Design a protein around this ligand. Structure first.
Ligand SMILES: CCN[C@H]1C[C@H](C)S(=O)(=O)c2sc(S(N)(=O)=O)cc21
Ligand SMILES: [Zn+2]
Length: 257
């Protein structure tokens, strides 16, 4: 049904998912002069040393790396969060050219891509219950800019050939997501939504100020993936990002001066 083409892309989504026009939709533009420093915000606590990755999957919209979230192995706490959030998957959004691809923007600046590390609030017992709650998910968003290669991304890049088309998956164990983080954990935060259907308004967004660098050759390999299934006409997976939505009655808070 929905996708990112001319006839089923973001401008059409509201017809099947009316919450598309809701009050806390993502992504948004981060105006750095209007964001408010909030000294009551705690530092982020990212505890990923015991992460267990299982599988990488092309789902027709992006590729997801999935984790075992049956226990508190890889968790996100602190920051604006109350309680413990478990890592369940990560994925990227990216562009057909280096000057677009991110979902969030900073002072209208687009980055080449954006990484989303998706976590769910354990107080709700399973992921399906969590997405129905206003504080059910926490997504950590990290910008990618093109420059020097990120060594810790290369294992992801090398496996992409094996999941070229929709519905394909491959074993992907022992991947350490700490290799994807920037040096600093300074962030902006605001309450928002999933950026794809079903567009539920269940996310605390935590967007890191410092981007990571990837090489042009790395991001080029993302662009060789396919939206379509095997045996269907080829449609390159590029520009799988939703444009910025109105901020409405929300304030973006910063953890840093
Ligand atoms: C293709 C659907 N993806 C949806 C439904 C998945 C079940 S999810 O894990 O809730 C999730 S997280 C995001 S994002 N872009 O806001 O981080 C989109 C989605
Ligand atoms: Zn995403």
């Amino acid at each position: 049904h929905w996708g990112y083409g001319k006839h089923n892309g973001p401008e059409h989504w509201h017809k099947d998912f009316p919450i598309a026009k809701g009050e806390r939709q993502s992504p948004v533009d981060i105006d750095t002069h209007t964001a408010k420093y909030d000294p009551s915000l705690k530092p982020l606590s990212v505890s990923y040393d015991q992460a267990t990755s299982l599988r990488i999957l092309n789902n027709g919209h992006a590729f997801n790396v999935e984790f075992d979230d049956s226990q508190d192995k890889a968790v996100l706490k602190g920051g604006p969060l109350d309680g413990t959030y478990r890592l369940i998957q990560f994925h990227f959004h990216w562009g057909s050219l280096d000057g677009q691809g991110s979902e969030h923007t900073v002072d209208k600046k687009k980055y080449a891509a954006e990484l989303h590390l998706v976590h769910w609030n354990t107080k709700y017992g399973d992921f399906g219950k969590a997405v129905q709650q206003p504080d059910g998910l926490a997504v950590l968003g990290i910008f990618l800019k093109v420059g020097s290669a990120k060594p810790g991304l290369q294992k992801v890049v090398d496996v992409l050939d094996s999941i070229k088309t929709k519905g394909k998956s491959a074993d992907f164990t022992n991947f350490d997501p700490r290799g994807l983080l920037p040096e600093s954990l300074d962030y902006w935060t605001y309450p928002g939504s999933l950026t794809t259907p079903p567009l539920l308004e269940c996310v605390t967004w935590i967007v890191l100020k410092e981007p990571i660098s990837v090489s042009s050759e790395q991001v080029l390999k993302f662009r060789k993936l396919n939206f379509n299934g095997e045996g269907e006409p080829e449609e390159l997976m590029v520009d799988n990002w939703r444009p910025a939505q109105p901020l409405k009655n929300r304030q973006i808070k910063a953890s840093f001066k």
